[PDB]
Write a protein that binds this ligand. Sequence first.
Ligand SMILES: *[C@@H]1O[C@H](CO)[C@@H](O[C@@H]2O[C@H](CO)[C@@H](O)[C@H](O)[C@H]2NC(C)=O)[C@H](O)[C@H]1NC(C)=O
Ligand SMILES: *[C@@H]1O[C@H](CO)[C@@H](O[C@@H]2O[C@H](CO)[C@@H](O)[C@H](O)[C@H]2NC(C)=O)[C@H](O)[C@H]1NC(C)=O
Ligand SMILES: *[C@@H]1O[C@H](CO)[C@@H](O[C@@H]2O[C@H](CO)[C@@H](O)[C@H](O)[C@H]2NC(C)=O)[C@H](O)[C@H]1NC(C)=O
Ligand SMILES: *[C@@H]1O[C@H](CO)[C@@H](O[C@@H]2O[C@H](CO)[C@@H](O)[C@H](O)[C@H]2NC(C)=O)[C@H](O)[C@H]1NC(C)=O
Ligand SMILES: *[C@@H]1O[C@H](CO)[C@@H](O[C@@H]2O[C@H](CO)[C@@H](O)[C@H](O)[C@H]2NC(C)=O)[C@H](O)[C@H]1NC(C)=O
Ligand SMILES: *[C@@H]1O[C@H](CO)[C@@H](O)[C@H](O)[C@H]1NC(C)=O
Ligand SMILES: *[C@@H]1O[C@H](CO)[C@@H](O)[C@H](O)[C@H]1NC(C)=O
Ligand SMILES: *[C@@H]1O[C@H](CO)[C@@H](O)[C@H](O)[C@H]1NC(C)=O
Ligand SMILES: *[C@@H]1O[C@H](CO)[C@@H](O)[C@H](O)[C@H]1NC(C)=O
Ligand SMILES: *[C@@H]1O[C@H](CO)[C@@H](O)[C@H](O)[C@H]1NC(C)=O
Ligand SMILES: *[C@@H]1O[C@H](CO)[C@@H](O)[C@H](O)[C@H]1NC(C)=O
Ligand SMILES: *[C@@H]1O[C@H](CO)[C@@H](O)[C@H](O)[C@H]1NC(C)=O
Lengths: 204, 413, 165
Amino acid sequence: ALGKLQDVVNQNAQALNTLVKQLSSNFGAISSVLNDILSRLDPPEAEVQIDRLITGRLQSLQTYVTQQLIRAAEIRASANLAATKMSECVLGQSKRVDFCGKGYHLMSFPQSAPHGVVFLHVTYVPAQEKNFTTAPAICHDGKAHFPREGVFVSNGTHWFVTQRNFYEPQIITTDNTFVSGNCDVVIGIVNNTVYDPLQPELDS
Amino acid sequence: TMSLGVENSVAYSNNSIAIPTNFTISVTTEILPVSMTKTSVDCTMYICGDSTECSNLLLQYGSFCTQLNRALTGIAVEQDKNTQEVFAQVKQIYKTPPIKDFGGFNFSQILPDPSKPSKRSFIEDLLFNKVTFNGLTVLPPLLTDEMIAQYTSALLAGTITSGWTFGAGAALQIPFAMQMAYRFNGIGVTQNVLYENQKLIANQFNSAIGKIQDSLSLGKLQDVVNQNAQALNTLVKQLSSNFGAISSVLNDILSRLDPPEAEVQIDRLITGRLQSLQTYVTQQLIRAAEIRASANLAATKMSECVLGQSKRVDFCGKGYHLMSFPQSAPHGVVFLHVTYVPAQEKNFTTAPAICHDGKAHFPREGVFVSNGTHWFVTQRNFYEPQIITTDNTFVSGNCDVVIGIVNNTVYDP
Amino acid sequence: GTGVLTESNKKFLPFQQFGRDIADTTDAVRDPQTLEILDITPCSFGGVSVITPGTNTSNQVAVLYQGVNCTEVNVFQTRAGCLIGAEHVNNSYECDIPIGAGICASYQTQSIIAYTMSLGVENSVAYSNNSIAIPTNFTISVTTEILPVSMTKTSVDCTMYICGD
Ligand SMILES: *[C@@H]1O[C@H](CO)[C@@H](O[C@@H]2O[C@H](CO)[C@@H](O)[C@H](O)[C@H]2NC(C)=O)[C@H](O)[C@H]1NC(C)=O
Ligand SMILES: *[C@@H]1O[C@H](CO)[C@@H](O[C@@H]2O[C@H](CO)[C@@H](O)[C@H](O)[C@H]2NC(C)=O)[C@H](O)[C@H]1NC(C)=O
Ligand SMILES: *[C@@H]1O[C@H](CO)[C@@H](O[C@@H]2O[C@H](CO)[C@@H](O)[C@H](O)[C@H]2NC(C)=O)[C@H](O)[C@H]1NC(C)=O
Ligand SMILES: *[C@@H]1O[C@H](CO)[C@@H](O[C@@H]2O[C@H](CO)[C@@H](O)[C@H](O)[C@H]2NC(C)=O)[C@H](O)[C@H]1NC(C)=O
Ligand SMILES: *[C@@H]1O[C@H](CO)[C@@H](O[C@@H]2O[C@H](CO)[C@@H](O)[C@H](O)[C@H]2NC(C)=O)[C@H](O)[C@H]1NC(C)=O
Ligand SMILES: *[C@@H]1O[C@H](CO)[C@@H](O)[C@H](O)[C@H]1NC(C)=O
Ligand SMILES: *[C@@H]1O[C@H](CO)[C@@H](O)[C@H](O)[C@H]1NC(C)=O
Ligand SMILES: *[C@@H]1O[C@H](CO)[C@@H](O)[C@H](O)[C@H]1NC(C)=O
Ligand SMILES: *[C@@H]1O[C@H](CO)[C@@H](O)[C@H](O)[C@H]1NC(C)=O
Ligand SMILES: *[C@@H]1O[C@H](CO)[C@@H](O)[C@H](O)[C@H]1NC(C)=O
Ligand SMILES: *[C@@H]1O[C@H](CO)[C@@H](O)[C@H](O)[C@H]1NC(C)=O
Ligand SMILES: *[C@@H]1O[C@H](CO)[C@@H](O)[C@H](O)[C@H]1NC(C)=O
């Protein structure tokens, strides 16, 4: 579960261990211990070997520092991404798909972790589906009616208007649909009746 | 001196608003690198090829060879991961339905062609045709181009038959005309615009696909390929340098000097070649970091541009983004972003509110525009004037407070 | 040199002798005893990769000689290289131990097998111009996303590291 953070810690430890171990390499010198070089050889001779050791160790240090700089750049990119998620995922809700966990994001909770941050993304995922017949619009009195919100469905006998992300059929009314054009334009319009809430009040 | 573009001046005034009366569906092609060549160099063979004495002398320097082999291997594994993140975002390999009655939209150019030896779509074929042994080897990518093609076709089939739903949960079939109605709702243009003009939109989209095909018929990807090839060729060529040694060829030095003497020459060559190798590895690490940023951007676009819809401006094409279609390409991904761009604007006189009986009415959605004699309320991204009524406007406050309120009548249904 | 000596299909011009390659390596040497324009090819080389399931599960392993013909080395040929010790199975599964070129290995019924990864199950969508699937229920799921943020604030006293007092 913690692969990403454990890999970071292991990489840093490996870098340090390699750097320390480099001290023992001869690098072409008679020995990897500086005092042994000083004692065994004369100063004029010892200078060459010590210079070779210094060259080797400086190259090793430079390699370590370059690796550290690159890895720190990668971690900075990760930290910028984490800060962006903290801002757009915890302190708010995000419309960005798959930015804040699979599904339609609801919220997040941050948690600290050694050298990292762990988000718990709470998301809403549709579960069960039913096949319905649908048509873009409904013509009632020669004028097309389109849903204000959600889509039209049919259970095989009657037409209803339901919100897009959750089945909750309701009677089609002039308060749920708006009129635009006539039946002669829309492709796939279907014939039905749109109930008028106002009519019964005036009839009685 | 460069022009910086054409000059323009907007006819701005405190009571003038331009409303678009027509629209164009434009498909733009955005190309992104995703992965690079998986190189691998054996430091021992590159530096001291087949020379036991040279290998022994190199051993002194310690773990330089090991950590170079670790860094290059890390780059290779990261490249495989980049491909995985960018493409393998669909749980289930969908396939397009046998009957392609997508509301008149013709996708045949982007969908796979079964007749080809590799199930790639026409655009993928054009893209593929567009882009073109001493210790160095190339490790083949984990996913062959055929599997990349399968993944892109699955993403595309889901985007066509299920919209964004397959991004959230199980792919929910939905007629393509209604899917575009949803997307038009997303950009703010009421859905009736789509149905009332489905044929025009379909023709515009098909023409856009044809134009993209003609345009393709790839600078960024070729740039990556050329840069990696250049780095490899430089690394290979460095082997010919003397670095102060009598001769670049190690074997000649071996048969030229006694072991004690040849030691100095071999040390000079080893330092030179090791420095060159370190330089190459650092350059590769940095360029691979750049490619990881590019591949992460590509994954983000795939997620928020294909599987969904973007409200982010200019992140997904230039315009009111409608949708996207992925396509593979050698070491990269090409997006066809379908966007809704208004055009054929017209000047109208505007006003922030309208007073009927001392009550100030404001539009629920859309703005008030007059053709000079009458006032109407119209959606902001299209010209659909409608009579001003209590249903289209909500009351608030009174006439005095607002600035620029004009007098009119609000019809009562 | 050490290589495979093979008569060159390319022929040196009568003056041409002892050519080199772009890499500066000896591409071909004209036959000294009897001019034959002999070419040199580096002997096959590659990387050995030990594909092994966790030792706790089993100690059985397979070997991948990368980018070498199986002849040069139960051997299975893959674009990645030659795979020795692994059984080739037509059935596809989810990639477990990636090998390359679409080939993945795993440990299953028990031995090590190599195969082509499936990429996931096939699911055709029942699309049609008047059919829609609208969810009737939902689920609230909590997923974990782990991000590195900082790395150890190391520092090195270069003078003391290089020189031991
Ligand atoms: C929906 O109803 C309308 C009328 O309410 C139908 O329109 C009829 O179409 C036929 C065939 O052209 C004409 O002969 C009739 O005169 C039309 N009716 C009217 C009132 O003009 C339409 O066909 C119906 N569609 C469906 C799918 O049931
Ligand atoms: C909106 O613009 C489109 C094209 O930008 C118009 O469609 C063109 O209409 C002309 C008629 O003036 C035809 O000659 C072209 O063949 C049409 N092109 C296409 C691609 O269909 C459309 O008429 C415009 N609509 C309005 C209301 O102005
Ligand atoms: C979708 O577009 C393709 C090409 O853009 C159409 O295929 C062409 O079909 C015509 C006959 O209808 C042939 O004469 C051409 O040679 C075909 N071209 C290619 C490249 O195959 C296809 O018919 C279109 N389909 C729809 C439904 O519009
Ligand atoms: C502004 O729009 C109104 C609304 O249609 C126009 O008034 C109509 O004009 C047409 C002729 O163009 C007449 O047939 C209608 O009887 C008019 N109806 C009403 C309610 O006035 C008006 O002409 C338009 N003015 C301009 C300058 O475009
Ligand atoms: C809009 O109409 C209102 C009344 O319907 C106008 O208010 C009048 O303002 C004048 C100038 O101060 C007063 O003398 C009147 O008594 C006001 N009318 C009423 C009913 O009190 C207002 O001026 C009109 N505005 C415009 C721009 O035409
Ligand atoms: C809808 O009908 C198709 C017909 O092939 C079927 O496969 C599918 O399972 C149905 N919907 C659901 C939710 O099962
Ligand atoms: C849907 O397509 C079928 C053919 O597959 C056709 O008979 C029917 O009229 C179409 N209906 C609509 C609304 O497009
Ligand atoms: C609006 O008026 C300005 C006045 O300069 C004119 O330039 C512009 O073309 C007009 N708008 C349209 C859509 O014609
Ligand atoms: C707009 O500005 C003009 C002056 O440029 C002024 O006469 C007019 O009253 C202003 N109208 C509104 C609604 O602000
Ligand atoms: C390997 O060698 C065999 C015969 O020795 C040959 O048939 C085959 O094509 C070779 N394959 C490769 C990849 O070199
Ligand atoms: C896979 O099936 C083919 C026939 O399609 C057969 O020739 C081959 O031997 C099978 N694989 C194995 C490992 O037997
Ligand atoms: C919805 O699903 C939950 C479990 O996921 C279940 O307890 C509940 O009864 C379901 N609701 C309906 C109406 O089936």
